[PDB]
Design a protein around this ligand. Structure first.
Ligand code: ZN
Length: 458
């Protein structure tokens, strides 16, 4: 029997042999195919990353979709944004062109080898919260549509590469270190950047779902140590590291500096706004205080939003903005693109900009910067105690779109609830070391008042 615990806020995730197996994939396919037909759709693209359980689960998923009466277009093993891309453009199928606007990618993303999961787009929307709980409920209830959908395999890689290459022409070749952590990003990302004219020093770009080198998880700096060492030991100029399904890009300079995605977004916003005067640029409440001012000085309108990739995507579709990015490293180009997050496309857009200068590392390092703390763990209940009763000494505003973002003249504090983990997340940024300390001291005393007696992590 299916476990409700695999149905998360933004996707479905489980562990092979424990909460996830072929039967589970099939019921999820049947539930999702049923929702597609109830919205009048008749087809779904499916794709997988390079995990060992991938081929079995994507086959079971396809069986379930077809049992609901939905046709399946299988684009095989490709990065996640390539499945999004297949759900965005006309497909030159053997029975004629066809447009298919829902997809499911079977992928465990940055997680250990035995994890896997499903990322779901239903008629262009990245479904979350109640719509995902509604798939679990159809399964419990056996409330399904019935039919006999067709199945076809389709390789969408050539259309994808040609679509990017035909719009991006680098000023000069740039020599890159590309680290895929043995994840699905490696083959097509290397193909793409070679197609743009770059020479590559490859790290772990062959598929190996045992992840025998380092997990493809650029969110941990320990997984970037190979790219940093390779940049010291070769004449490559810039390092790119992908997470396991390619919807996130990590960027390292020649001198070993990680460029966090809020700084990356400044560089993209500048170039995008130069062609879109006045446009909104969306980012989440974890991003640097520096973005608001940067975006204004560059002639745009900053729009600070909630954290969560699917929430940022919904907001992009609501506003028609040309660009969004989140601290976690998903970057969404609607300008000249399709508006889904894509690590390989972001890489290409970054090379377009970096190739205009002789020293890309100086360009990246010179982006605005500040001092910060790492993330701290302490949900929901205490966040409300804080909102109603906290005397934050000297703050300019307490922002409440997502937790409490407290803004000071010289930095900011954020306390919020996660959307998987059952505890409160904190982060701090300031314009000097002493200002970082005073801000924490301020949060410290507020949390001592709100939940008096608890052991804090700072
Ligand atoms: Zn990912």
């Amino acid at each position: 029997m299916i476990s409700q615990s695999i149905f998360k806020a933004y996707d479905i995730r489980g562990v092979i042999g424990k909460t996830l197996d072929a039967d589970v994939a099939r019921s999820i396919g049947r539930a999702f195919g049923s929702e597609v037909r109830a919205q009048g759709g008749d087809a779904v693209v499916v794709a997988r990353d390079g995990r060992l359980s991938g081929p079995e689960l994507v086959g079971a998923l396809a069986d379930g979709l077809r049992a609901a009466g939905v046709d399946v277009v299988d684009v095989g093993m490709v990065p996640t944004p390539v499945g999004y891309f297949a759900a965005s453009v006309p497909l030159a199928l053997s029975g004629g062109e066809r447009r298919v606007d829902s997809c499911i990618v079977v992928t465990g993303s940055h997680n250990p080898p035995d994890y896997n999961g499903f990322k779901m787009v239903l008629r262009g929307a990245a479904i979350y919260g109640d719509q995902i709980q509604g798939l679990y409920k159809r399964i419990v209830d056996a409330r399904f549509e019935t039919g006999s959908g067709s199945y076809e395999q389709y390789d969408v890689a050539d259309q994808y590469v040609e679509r990017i290459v035909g719009d991006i022409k680098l000023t000069r070749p740039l020599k890159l270190v590309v680290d895929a952590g043995n994840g699905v990003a490696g083959p097509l990302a290397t193909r793409l950047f070679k197609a743009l004219g770059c020479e590559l020093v490859e790290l772990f770009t062959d598929i190996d779902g045992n992840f025998p080198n380092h997990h493809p998880d650029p969110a941990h700096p320990e997984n970037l140590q190979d790219v940093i060492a390779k940049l010291k030991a070769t004449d490559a100029e810039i390092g790119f590291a992908f997470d396991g399904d390619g919807d996130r890009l990590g960027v390292v300079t020649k001198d070993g500096q990680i460029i966090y995605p809020d700084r990356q977004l400044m560089l993209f916003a500048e170039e995008v706004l130069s062609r879109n005067p006045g446009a909104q640029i969306i980012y989440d409440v974890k991003c640097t205080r520096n973005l608001a001012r940067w975006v204004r000085e560059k002639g745009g309108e900053p729009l600070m939003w909630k954290t969560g990739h699917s929430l940022v995507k919904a907001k992009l579709r609501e506003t028609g903005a040309p660009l969004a990015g989140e601290m976690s490293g998903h970057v969404f180009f609607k300008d000249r693109w399709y508006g889904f997050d894509d690590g390989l496309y972001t890489g290409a857009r970054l090379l377009e900009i970096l190739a205009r200068v002789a020293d890309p590392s100086a360009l990246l390092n010179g982006l605005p910067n500040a001092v910060s703390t790492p993330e701290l763990q302490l949900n929901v209940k205490l966040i409300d105690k804080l909102r109603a009763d906290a005397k934050f000494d000297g703050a300019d505003e307490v922002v409440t779109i997502d937790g409490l973002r407290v803004e000071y003249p010289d930095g900011f504090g954020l306390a919020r609830s996660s959307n998987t983990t059952p505890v409160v997340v904190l982060r701090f940024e300031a314009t000097s070391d002493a200002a970082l300390a005073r801000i924490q001291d301020d949060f410290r005393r507020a949390l001592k008042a709100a939940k008096p007696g608890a052991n804090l992590p700072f």
